[PDB]
Paper text:
[name] is one of several redundant exonucleases involved in the mismatch repair system, UV repair, homologous recombination and the stabilization of tandem repeats in [name]. Like TREX1/2, [name] contains only an exonuclease domain; however, it can act on both ssDNA and [name] in a distributive manner and digests only one or two nucleotides per reaction cycle. To elucidate the mechanism by which [name] is recognized and processed by single-domain DnaQ members, such as [name] and TREX1/2, we determined the structures of [name] in complex with three distinct [name] substrates: 3′ overhanging duplex DNA, a 12 bp blunt-ended [name] and 5′ overhanging partially mismatched duplex DNA, referred to here as complexes I, II and III, respectively. The crystal structures obtained revealed that [name] interacts with [name] via two DNA-binding sites, one for the substrate strand and another for the complementary strand.
Our structure of the blunt-ended DNA complex is the first to show the specific interaction of a DnaQ member with a blunt-ended [name]. Similar to complex I, two [name] monomers bind to the individual ends of one DNA molecule. First, in addition to the two residues that interacted with the complementary strand and were observed in the 3′ overhanging DNA complex (Lys101 and Arg104), an adjacent positively charged Arg87 residue was also involved in complementary strand binding via an interaction with the +2 and +3 nucleotides of the 5′ terminus. Second, the coordination of MeA in complexes I and II is different. Compared with the penta-coordination observed in complex I, MeA is tetra-coordinated in complex II, with one proposed water nucleophile missing, accompanied by a slight reorientation of the His134 side chain closer to the substrate phosphate. This difference may be attributed to the pH at which the crystals were grown (8.0 for complex I and 6.3 for complex II). Third, at both DNA ends (A and B) in complex II, a wedge composed of two key residues (Leu12 and Gln13) located in the loop between β1 and β2 (loop 1) was observed. Leu12 penetrates between the two terminal base pairs, while Gln13 is inserted halfway between the two terminal base pairs and forms an interaction with the second nucleotide of the 5′ terminus. The wedging of Leu12 and Gln13 results in a distortion of the first base pair and facilitates full insertion of the first substrate nucleotide into the active center. Therefore, the structure of complex II suggests that [name] unwinds the first base pair of the blunt-ended [name] and feeds the 3′ end of the substrate strand into the active center.
Author numbering:
A (entry chain B): 1 to 166
B (entry chain A): 1 to 167
The structure:
DNA sequence: GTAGATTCGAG
DNA sequence: CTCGAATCTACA
Protein backbone atom coordinates (compact mmCIF):
# COMPACT_ATOMS: atom_id res chain seq x y z
CA UNK A 1 0.00 0.00 0.00
CA UNK A 2 1.45 3.34 -1.13
CA UNK A 3 0.57 6.68 0.41
CA UNK A 4 0.98 9.80 -1.70
CA UNK A 5 1.74 12.72 0.51
CA UNK A 6 1.74 16.47 -0.19
CA UNK A 7 2.12 19.62 1.85
CA UNK A 8 1.60 23.36 1.36
CA UNK A 9 3.93 25.62 3.29
CA UNK A 10 4.68 29.23 4.30
CA UNK A 11 7.63 29.09 1.88
CA UNK A 12 10.73 27.21 0.79
CA UNK A 13 12.34 27.19 4.25
CA UNK A 14 9.39 25.36 5.86
CA UNK A 15 6.05 25.83 7.69
CA UNK A 16 2.88 23.94 6.75
CA UNK A 17 -0.35 25.62 5.66
CA UNK A 18 -1.86 22.24 4.72
CA UNK A 19 -1.25 18.56 4.40
CA UNK A 20 -3.11 15.94 2.38
CA UNK A 21 -2.80 12.32 1.27
CA UNK A 22 -4.35 9.67 -0.91
CA UNK A 23 -3.61 5.93 -0.97
CA UNK A 24 -2.72 3.87 -4.03
CA UNK A 25 -3.88 0.25 -3.74
CA UNK A 26 -4.29 -2.12 -6.68
CA UNK A 27 -3.93 0.69 -9.20
CA UNK A 28 -6.73 2.74 -7.70
CA UNK A 29 -6.73 5.92 -5.62
CA UNK A 30 -8.55 5.57 -2.29
CA UNK A 31 -8.78 7.01 1.24
CA UNK A 32 -8.16 10.75 0.76
CA UNK A 33 -7.34 12.89 3.83
CA UNK A 34 -6.61 16.59 4.06
CA UNK A 35 -5.98 19.08 6.85
CA UNK A 36 -5.44 22.78 7.01
CA UNK A 37 -2.70 23.38 9.57
CA UNK A 38 -1.64 26.25 11.83
CA UNK A 39 1.95 27.06 10.77
CA UNK A 40 4.91 27.74 13.07
CA UNK A 41 5.61 31.07 11.35
CA UNK A 42 3.98 33.75 9.17
CA UNK A 43 2.82 32.85 5.67
CA UNK A 44 5.08 34.56 3.17
CA UNK A 45 3.37 36.53 0.34
CA UNK A 46 5.27 34.54 -2.37
CA UNK A 47 3.84 31.29 -1.05
CA UNK A 48 0.31 32.64 -0.54
CA UNK A 49 0.33 33.81 -4.18
CA UNK A 50 0.76 30.12 -4.91
CA UNK A 51 -1.60 28.11 -2.66
CA UNK A 52 -3.73 31.11 -1.68
CA UNK A 53 -4.20 29.95 1.91
CA UNK A 54 -4.63 32.88 4.25
CA UNK A 55 -3.77 33.44 7.91
CA UNK A 56 -7.46 33.52 8.80
CA UNK A 57 -7.85 30.06 7.20
CA UNK A 58 -5.27 28.43 9.43
CA UNK A 59 -5.60 30.46 12.65
CA UNK A 60 -8.02 28.15 14.42
CA UNK A 61 -6.34 24.92 13.24
CA UNK A 62 -4.05 22.42 14.94
CA UNK A 63 -0.26 22.48 14.99
CA UNK A 64 1.46 20.07 12.60
CA UNK A 65 2.54 18.03 15.62
CA UNK A 66 -1.11 17.26 16.28
CA UNK A 67 -2.19 16.52 12.72
CA UNK A 68 0.78 14.53 11.44
CA UNK A 69 -0.17 11.33 13.30
CA UNK A 70 -3.30 11.03 11.19
CA UNK A 71 -0.92 10.18 8.37
CA UNK A 72 1.01 7.46 10.20
CA UNK A 73 0.80 3.79 9.38
CA UNK A 74 1.83 3.49 5.75
CA UNK A 75 4.95 1.58 4.86
CA UNK A 76 5.67 3.87 1.99
CA UNK A 77 5.39 7.63 1.60
CA UNK A 78 5.37 9.01 -1.92
CA UNK A 79 5.89 12.61 -2.91
CA UNK A 80 6.93 14.72 -5.90
CA UNK A 81 10.34 16.06 -4.97
CA UNK A 82 10.00 14.04 -1.77
CA UNK A 83 13.12 15.65 -0.31
CA UNK A 84 11.08 18.85 0.10
CA UNK A 85 8.22 17.26 2.01
CA UNK A 86 10.48 15.08 4.12
CA UNK A 87 12.40 18.21 5.15
CA UNK A 88 9.48 20.50 6.03
CA UNK A 89 7.42 17.78 7.76
CA UNK A 90 8.29 16.11 11.01
CA UNK A 91 9.74 12.62 10.94
CA UNK A 92 7.56 10.12 9.11
CA UNK A 93 7.67 6.51 10.29
CA UNK A 94 8.19 4.84 6.89
CA UNK A 95 10.27 4.88 3.72
CA UNK A 96 10.22 7.58 1.07
CA UNK A 97 9.61 7.41 -2.69
CA UNK A 98 10.22 10.30 -5.09
CA UNK A 99 8.05 10.37 -8.26
CA UNK A 100 10.32 13.08 -9.67
CA UNK A 101 13.41 10.86 -9.58
CA UNK A 102 11.44 7.96 -11.05
CA UNK A 103 9.98 10.06 -13.85
CA UNK A 104 13.49 11.08 -14.87
CA UNK A 105 14.75 7.49 -14.93
CA UNK A 106 11.76 6.49 -17.09
CA UNK A 107 11.42 9.51 -19.41
CA UNK A 108 14.70 11.43 -19.94
CA UNK A 109 15.05 14.89 -21.48
CA UNK A 110 11.71 16.41 -20.51
CA UNK A 111 10.22 18.72 -17.86
CA UNK A 112 9.58 17.20 -14.41
CA UNK A 113 7.21 19.45 -12.48
CA UNK A 114 4.23 17.69 -10.93
CA UNK A 115 1.95 19.26 -13.48
CA UNK A 116 4.16 19.06 -16.57
CA UNK A 117 4.49 15.29 -16.23
CA UNK A 118 0.71 15.14 -15.87
CA UNK A 119 0.10 16.80 -19.24
CA UNK A 120 3.07 15.22 -21.06
CA UNK A 121 1.82 11.78 -19.99
CA UNK A 122 -1.70 12.89 -20.91
CA UNK A 123 -3.10 11.74 -17.61
CA UNK A 124 -6.61 12.01 -16.22
CA UNK A 125 -7.88 11.72 -12.66
CA UNK A 126 -11.05 12.69 -10.84
CA UNK A 127 -9.97 15.53 -8.54
CA UNK A 128 -12.08 16.56 -5.54
CA UNK A 129 -14.64 19.41 -5.85
CA UNK A 130 -13.74 22.79 -4.32
CA UNK A 131 -10.01 22.23 -4.54
CA UNK A 132 -7.80 23.89 -7.16
CA UNK A 133 -4.22 23.05 -8.12
CA UNK A 134 -1.62 23.73 -5.45
CA UNK A 135 -3.86 22.49 -2.72
CA UNK A 136 -2.52 19.60 -0.69
CA UNK A 137 -5.25 17.22 -1.82
CA UNK A 138 -5.67 18.17 -5.45
CA UNK A 139 -1.94 17.81 -6.05
CA UNK A 140 -2.09 14.43 -4.27
CA UNK A 141 -4.48 13.17 -6.93
CA UNK A 142 -2.08 14.46 -9.54
CA UNK A 143 1.00 12.84 -7.99
CA UNK A 144 -0.90 9.58 -7.46
CA UNK A 145 -2.05 9.44 -11.07
CA UNK A 146 1.58 9.90 -11.97
CA UNK A 147 2.74 7.07 -9.69
CA UNK A 148 0.16 4.70 -11.14
CA UNK A 149 1.46 5.58 -14.59
CA UNK A 150 5.02 4.94 -13.40
CA UNK A 151 4.01 1.55 -11.94
CA UNK A 152 2.04 0.53 -15.05
CA UNK A 153 5.03 1.51 -17.20
CA UNK A 154 7.84 -0.12 -15.27
CA UNK A 155 6.23 -2.72 -13.04
CA UNK A 156 8.38 -1.37 -10.19
CA UNK A 157 7.37 -2.46 -6.69
CA UNK A 158 7.29 -0.16 -3.68
CA UNK A 159 10.58 -1.65 -2.48
CA UNK A 160 12.24 -1.08 -5.85
CA UNK A 161 10.87 2.47 -6.03
CA UNK A 162 12.40 3.23 -2.64
CA UNK A 163 15.73 1.72 -3.66
CA UNK A 164 15.78 4.08 -6.62
CA UNK A 165 14.76 6.94 -4.32
CA UNK A 166 17.63 6.38 -1.84
CA UNK B 1 49.63 46.48 -15.85
CA UNK B 2 47.90 43.16 -16.48
CA UNK B 3 49.91 40.05 -17.30
CA UNK B 4 48.20 37.41 -19.37
CA UNK B 5 49.47 33.95 -18.41
CA UNK B 6 49.05 30.71 -20.36
CA UNK B 7 50.40 27.21 -19.99
CA UNK B 8 50.65 24.00 -22.11
CA UNK B 9 50.63 20.80 -20.03
CA UNK B 10 50.86 16.97 -20.03
CA UNK B 11 47.20 16.47 -19.07
CA UNK B 12 44.52 17.91 -16.87
CA UNK B 13 46.49 17.11 -13.69
CA UNK B 14 49.52 19.21 -14.61
CA UNK B 15 53.07 18.88 -15.83
CA UNK B 16 54.30 21.93 -17.69
CA UNK B 17 55.68 21.69 -21.21
CA UNK B 18 55.28 25.36 -22.11
CA UNK B 19 54.63 28.72 -20.52
CA UNK B 20 54.18 32.22 -21.91
CA UNK B 21 52.87 35.65 -21.11
CA UNK B 22 52.19 39.08 -22.56
CA UNK B 23 51.63 42.37 -20.82
CA UNK B 24 48.59 44.57 -21.38
CA UNK B 25 49.20 48.26 -20.66
CA UNK B 26 46.65 50.92 -21.68
CA UNK B 27 44.99 48.57 -24.17
CA UNK B 28 48.30 47.63 -25.76
CA UNK B 29 50.02 44.25 -25.73
CA UNK B 30 53.75 44.36 -24.95
CA UNK B 31 56.62 42.40 -23.34
CA UNK B 32 55.94 38.90 -24.74
CA UNK B 33 57.70 35.97 -23.06
CA UNK B 34 57.59 32.21 -23.59
CA UNK B 35 59.55 29.13 -22.57
CA UNK B 36 59.40 25.49 -23.50
CA UNK B 37 59.73 23.52 -20.28
CA UNK B 38 60.72 19.97 -19.36
CA UNK B 39 57.75 18.47 -17.55
CA UNK B 40 57.96 16.62 -14.27
CA UNK B 41 56.02 13.80 -15.97
CA UNK B 42 55.22 12.10 -19.28
CA UNK B 43 53.33 14.00 -21.96
CA UNK B 44 50.08 12.06 -22.32
CA UNK B 45 48.90 11.52 -25.89
CA UNK B 46 45.64 13.38 -25.07
CA UNK B 47 47.54 16.55 -24.27
CA UNK B 48 49.98 16.02 -27.17
CA UNK B 49 47.17 15.91 -29.73
CA UNK B 50 46.26 19.42 -28.57
CA UNK B 51 49.47 21.39 -28.10
CA UNK B 52 51.54 19.30 -30.48
CA UNK B 53 54.69 19.36 -28.29
CA UNK B 54 56.75 16.15 -28.31
CA UNK B 55 58.99 14.74 -25.57
CA UNK B 56 62.00 15.47 -27.80
CA UNK B 57 60.98 19.11 -28.05
CA UNK B 58 61.40 19.64 -24.31
CA UNK B 59 63.92 16.93 -23.36
CA UNK B 60 66.75 19.35 -22.59
CA UNK B 61 64.73 22.35 -21.50
CA UNK B 62 64.73 23.73 -17.97
CA UNK B 63 62.22 22.59 -15.33
CA UNK B 64 59.34 24.88 -14.37
CA UNK B 65 61.24 25.82 -11.20
CA UNK B 66 64.13 27.38 -13.15
CA UNK B 67 61.87 29.33 -15.44
CA UNK B 68 58.95 30.60 -13.35
CA UNK B 69 61.09 33.39 -11.93
CA UNK B 70 60.86 35.28 -15.23
CA UNK B 71 57.07 35.43 -14.84
CA UNK B 72 56.82 36.61 -11.22
CA UNK B 73 56.36 40.20 -10.14
CA UNK B 74 53.17 41.33 -11.87
CA UNK B 75 50.44 42.74 -9.60
CA UNK B 76 47.67 41.18 -11.66
CA UNK B 77 47.59 37.90 -13.53
CA UNK B 78 45.05 37.13 -16.23
CA UNK B 79 44.22 33.69 -17.60
CA UNK B 80 41.36 31.96 -19.37
CA UNK B 81 39.98 29.60 -16.72
CA UNK B 82 42.65 30.82 -14.31
CA UNK B 83 41.58 28.05 -11.98
CA UNK B 84 43.51 25.67 -14.23
CA UNK B 85 46.77 27.61 -14.71
CA UNK B 86 46.75 28.57 -11.03
CA UNK B 87 46.55 24.88 -10.11
CA UNK B 88 49.24 23.46 -12.37
CA UNK B 89 51.73 26.35 -12.11
CA UNK B 90 53.87 27.10 -9.05
CA UNK B 91 52.20 29.47 -6.55
CA UNK B 92 52.08 32.99 -7.99
CA UNK B 93 51.90 36.34 -6.24
CA UNK B 94 49.53 39.11 -7.36
CA UNK B 95 45.78 39.06 -8.01
CA UNK B 96 44.03 36.74 -10.45
CA UNK B 97 41.56 37.63 -13.18
CA UNK B 98 39.63 34.95 -15.11
CA UNK B 99 38.45 35.96 -18.60
CA UNK B 100 36.14 32.95 -18.75
CA UNK B 101 34.25 34.18 -15.71
CA UNK B 102 34.18 37.76 -17.03
CA UNK B 103 32.83 36.62 -20.37
CA UNK B 104 30.17 34.55 -18.66
CA UNK B 105 28.99 37.58 -16.72
CA UNK B 106 29.24 40.08 -19.56
CA UNK B 107 27.62 37.84 -22.20
CA UNK B 108 25.39 35.10 -20.76
CA UNK B 109 24.07 32.36 -23.02
CA UNK B 110 27.04 31.65 -25.26
CA UNK B 111 30.20 29.47 -25.32
CA UNK B 112 33.15 30.46 -23.16
CA UNK B 113 36.19 28.68 -24.57
CA UNK B 114 39.10 30.94 -25.52
CA UNK B 115 38.39 30.10 -29.17
CA UNK B 116 34.56 30.23 -29.02
CA UNK B 117 34.80 33.79 -27.68
CA UNK B 118 37.44 34.70 -30.23
CA UNK B 119 34.89 33.94 -32.92
CA UNK B 120 31.74 35.39 -31.33
CA UNK B 121 33.48 38.64 -30.39
CA UNK B 122 35.04 38.58 -33.83
CA UNK B 123 38.41 39.49 -32.35
CA UNK B 124 41.50 40.53 -34.28
CA UNK B 125 44.89 39.85 -32.82
CA UNK B 126 48.44 39.83 -34.14
CA UNK B 127 49.69 36.30 -33.48
CA UNK B 128 53.30 35.16 -33.24
CA UNK B 129 55.10 33.53 -36.17
CA UNK B 130 55.22 29.74 -36.68
CA UNK B 131 52.83 28.75 -33.89
CA UNK B 132 49.16 27.77 -33.67
CA UNK B 133 46.16 27.37 -31.38
CA UNK B 134 47.16 25.86 -28.02
CA UNK B 135 50.71 27.17 -28.06
CA UNK B 136 50.92 29.19 -24.79
CA UNK B 137 52.28 32.29 -26.54
CA UNK B 138 49.80 32.04 -29.42
CA UNK B 139 46.92 31.70 -26.94
CA UNK B 140 48.19 34.60 -24.87
CA UNK B 141 47.58 36.98 -27.77
CA UNK B 142 44.11 35.52 -28.17
CA UNK B 143 43.29 35.84 -24.47
CA UNK B 144 44.84 39.32 -24.42
CA UNK B 145 42.60 40.51 -27.27
CA UNK B 146 39.58 39.10 -25.43
CA UNK B 147 40.57 40.94 -22.28
CA UNK B 148 40.93 44.20 -24.17
CA UNK B 149 37.48 43.64 -25.67
CA UNK B 150 36.00 42.75 -22.28
CA UNK B 151 37.40 45.96 -20.78
CA UNK B 152 36.32 48.24 -23.59
CA UNK B 153 32.85 46.72 -23.51
CA UNK B 154 32.31 46.69 -19.74
CA UNK B 155 34.66 49.47 -18.64
CA UNK B 156 35.45 47.27 -15.62
CA UNK B 157 38.58 48.13 -13.66
CA UNK B 158 41.07 45.44 -12.67
CA UNK B 159 39.86 45.59 -9.06
CA UNK B 160 36.31 45.10 -10.36
CA UNK B 161 37.51 42.20 -12.53
CA UNK B 162 39.26 40.54 -9.55
CA UNK B 163 36.06 40.87 -7.55
CA UNK B 164 34.10 39.15 -10.30
CA UNK B 165 36.75 36.43 -10.57
CA UNK B 166 36.48 35.62 -6.87
CA UNK B 167 38.97 37.13 -4.45
C1' DG C 1 16.65 27.75 1.12
C1' DT C 2 17.82 22.49 -0.25
C1' DA C 3 20.30 19.12 -2.06
C1' DG C 4 21.17 16.48 -6.17
C1' DA C 5 22.00 16.20 -11.14
C1' DT C 6 24.06 18.36 -15.15
C1' DT C 7 27.18 21.31 -17.55
C1' DC C 8 31.65 23.01 -19.17
C1' DG C 9 35.98 24.84 -19.27
C1' DA C 10 41.34 23.82 -19.03
C1' DG C 11 45.65 20.10 -21.56
C1' DC D 1 39.96 10.79 -21.48
C1' DT D 2 39.56 14.58 -14.86
C1' DC D 3 36.99 17.37 -11.87
C1' DG D 4 35.77 21.74 -9.71
C1' DA D 5 32.95 25.62 -9.61
C1' DA D 6 28.94 27.47 -11.83
C1' DT D 7 24.35 26.54 -13.46
C1' DC D 8 19.92 24.11 -13.40
C1' DT D 9 15.78 22.06 -11.21
C1' DA D 10 12.17 20.49 -8.37
C1' DC D 11 9.47 21.98 -3.83
C1' DA D 12 6.00 26.63 -1.20
NA1 LIG E 1 4.36 19.48 -2.96
NA1 LIG F 1 1.20 21.23 -3.90
NA1 LIG G 1 45.37 27.74 -20.91
NA1 LIG H 1 46.57 27.33 -24.38
Amino acid sequence: MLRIIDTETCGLQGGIVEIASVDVIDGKIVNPMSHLVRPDRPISPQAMAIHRITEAMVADKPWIEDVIPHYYGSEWYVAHNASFDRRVLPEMPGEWICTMKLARRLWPGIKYSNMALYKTRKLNVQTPPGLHHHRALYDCYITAALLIDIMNTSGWTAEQMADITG
